[PDB]
Amino acid sequence: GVITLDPQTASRSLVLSEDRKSVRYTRQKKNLPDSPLRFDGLPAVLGFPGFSSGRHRWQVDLQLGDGGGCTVGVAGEGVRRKGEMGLSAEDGVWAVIISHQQCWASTSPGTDLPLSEIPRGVRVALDYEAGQVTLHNAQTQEPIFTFTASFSGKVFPFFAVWKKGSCLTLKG
């Protein structure tokens, strides 16, 4: 199922590609119009569509710039869009944060992940009725994390990326 990046949610710190399948961080903010839906404080963007039911999978390839990082997972539709405050599963973000030496799951408090290696891609699997979000290393199949939750209403693919040279690209 085709997932794309939703420009109407994208932080001004994010440049979506013309095909809306990739996104890079920009130090110079884009002139995106103000909206209550738009991330402002975190360099984040939702996917489209969101999901109310069923099993869904997608893959995110990632490149990090110097001192860079990204966040890959899922977010409840009610996720706060405004402020610089880090989001966690309390805020309805179930994601892994990847940086050059250190990856962590967005539990509350956060879980440091002792991975064989830093991923260069992440496979996300949502099972809405099972209340599970599973993350694997897309290339090696190393398990990264499994979140267990009870979902109500729509759950969206969630992405964030930061520092120059950092970028994400969606695959099937």
Residue numbers in the entry: 294 to 465
Quote the paper.
In the TRIM15 crystal structure, a reasonably pronounced pocket was observed, with a solvent-accessible area of 83 Å2 and a solvent-accessible volume of 46 Å3. TRIM15 lacks the arginine at the center of the pocket seen in TRIM10, which is replaced by an isoleucine (Ile390), resulting in a substantially more hydrophobic pocket. There are two tryptophan side chains on opposite sides of the binding pocket (Trp397 and Trp455) that provide hydrophobic docking surfaces. Trp397 is conserved in TRIM10 but adopts a different conformation in TRIM15, pointing toward the center of the pocket rather than outward.
